[PDB]
Ligand binder design. Sequence first.
Ligand SMILES: NC(=O)c1ccc[n+]([C@@H]2O[C@H](COP(=O)([O-])OP(=O)(O)OC[C@H]3O[C@@H](n4cnc5c(N)ncnc54)[C@H](O)[C@@H]3O)[C@@H](O)[C@H]2O)c1
Ligand SMILES: NC(=O)c1ccc[n+]([C@@H]2O[C@H](COP(=O)([O-])OP(=O)(O)OC[C@H]3O[C@@H](n4cnc5c(N)ncnc54)[C@H](O)[C@@H]3O)[C@@H](O)[C@H]2O)c1
Ligand SMILES: Cc1cc2nc3c(=O)[nH]c(=O)nc-3n(C[C@H](O)[C@H](O)[C@H](O)COP(=O)(O)O)c2cc1C
Ligand SMILES: Cc1cc2nc3c(=O)[nH]c(=O)nc-3n(C[C@H](O)[C@H](O)[C@H](O)COP(=O)(O)O)c2cc1C
Lengths: 155, 155
Amino acid sequence: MAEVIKSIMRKFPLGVAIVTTNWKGELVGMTVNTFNSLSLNPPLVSFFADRMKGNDIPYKESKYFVVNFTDNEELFNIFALKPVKERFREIKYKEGIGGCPILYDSYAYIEAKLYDTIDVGDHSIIVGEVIDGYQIRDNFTPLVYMNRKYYKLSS
Amino acid sequence: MAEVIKSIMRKFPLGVAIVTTNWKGELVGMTVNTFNSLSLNPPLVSFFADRMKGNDIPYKESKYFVVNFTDNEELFNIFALKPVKERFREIKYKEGIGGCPILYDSYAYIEAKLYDTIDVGDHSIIVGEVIDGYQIRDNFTPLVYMNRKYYKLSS
Ligand SMILES: NC(=O)c1ccc[n+]([C@@H]2O[C@H](COP(=O)([O-])OP(=O)(O)OC[C@H]3O[C@@H](n4cnc5c(N)ncnc54)[C@H](O)[C@@H]3O)[C@@H](O)[C@H]2O)c1
Ligand SMILES: NC(=O)c1ccc[n+]([C@@H]2O[C@H](COP(=O)([O-])OP(=O)(O)OC[C@H]3O[C@@H](n4cnc5c(N)ncnc54)[C@H](O)[C@@H]3O)[C@@H](O)[C@H]2O)c1
Ligand SMILES: Cc1cc2nc3c(=O)[nH]c(=O)nc-3n(C[C@H](O)[C@H](O)[C@H](O)COP(=O)(O)O)c2cc1C
Ligand SMILES: Cc1cc2nc3c(=O)[nH]c(=O)nc-3n(C[C@H](O)[C@H](O)[C@H](O)COP(=O)(O)O)c2cc1C
């Protein structure tokens, strides 16, 4: 059934984001296709973190996280494929709340306070309360991920 | 902050699906942009159901649900905009597991057993264990929802 999930999801298009945190001083982040809005009152956003890779642990052990929205495919590939220790060497960034890294190439970002974590199956649902949101750049081309590719929207 | 969430999400592209169930004999479903894969082992998928509209209740009170994947924008609009009592009058469907409606225009669907529900903020995370998946049609144009529109992917 893991294979039927992957086969169906390969053709299910999803927006991508790069979630980051400052994990006891270590700058970390990852490309996710599970980011979404969860609640309006209270204002909550979420993503799913793979427990099998320990992707949950930095967020569980940090008070805040940042959601970076970017149109730079290179950044998504860095934050999916490159070794953790290498990712923040290659990109421009600044620190936000809790020291969480904000990527300079982001056209928007959210700063969130960790609100809850919920283990379900082999992932943890990471839930953040939106503390602030910023729209930096008005002109951008949002990307959607499907079948290992990053597409623009038609028209 | 509910407004910053909406403003950012308006420009965050997301695949859409129509989740259905047979709620004590009542055929119901809704367009969602919160469907995703949650876990591989066990094989779990999820969506977020708005408690403010009672969208959580049918799933909480039914043993199964179906995830319909379709490329028919008309269907997404029916299952977002039209009165509940009208939706299954206008479309071709059959019943699957638990009597859950499978839409004829779906190019793929998942049958799921309700695994857990988790209230977080003003939504409930509805979690289903994948019992079966089906790819009916190999030729289709997946849609992504952004800024109230249903886009095709470029190229
Ligand atoms: N944890 C996640 O939700 C998730 C999502 C996408 C990619 N990834 C990781 O990146 C790798 C490369 O991605 P790809 O697009 O080539 O994947 P793929 O070809 O292995 O799978 C296609 C799709 O299936 C779903 N999926 C795959 N692995 C999953 C997992 N462990 N848990 C929940 N859903 C999963 C994702 O939506 C993915 O894009 C994946 O094999 C996976 O290890 C993880
Ligand atoms: N519950 C949901 O996750 C959700 C998602 C999309 C749309 N909707 C409902 O459909 C209506 C029409 O959609 P639209 O695209 O014109 O919306 P919109 O212009 O009001 O908001 C834009 C986006 O913000 C997010 N959002 C809006 N309402 C939300 C809610 N109650 N909870 C979590 N996230 C929410 C969604 O991703 C939505 O597409 C929305 O106002 C909402 O009531 C609900
Ligand atoms: C487009 C894309 C989407 C991804 N989405 C998620 C996700 O939502 N959750 C997750 O835990 N991992 C996801 N991954 C994998 C993480 O990015 C990856 O495990 C993380 O960067 C840590 O990398 P590492 O284990 O190789 O060091 C995704 C990968 C890609 C290619
Ligand atoms: C594209 C789109 C995405 C939606 N996603 C969700 C969702 O994920 N969860 C939810 O509870 N409602 C979502 N909604 C709203 C439901 O479709 C709607 O509340 C449901 O069909 C019941 O309709 P009603 O309250 O008008 O009767 C979405 C609406 C649209 C337009």
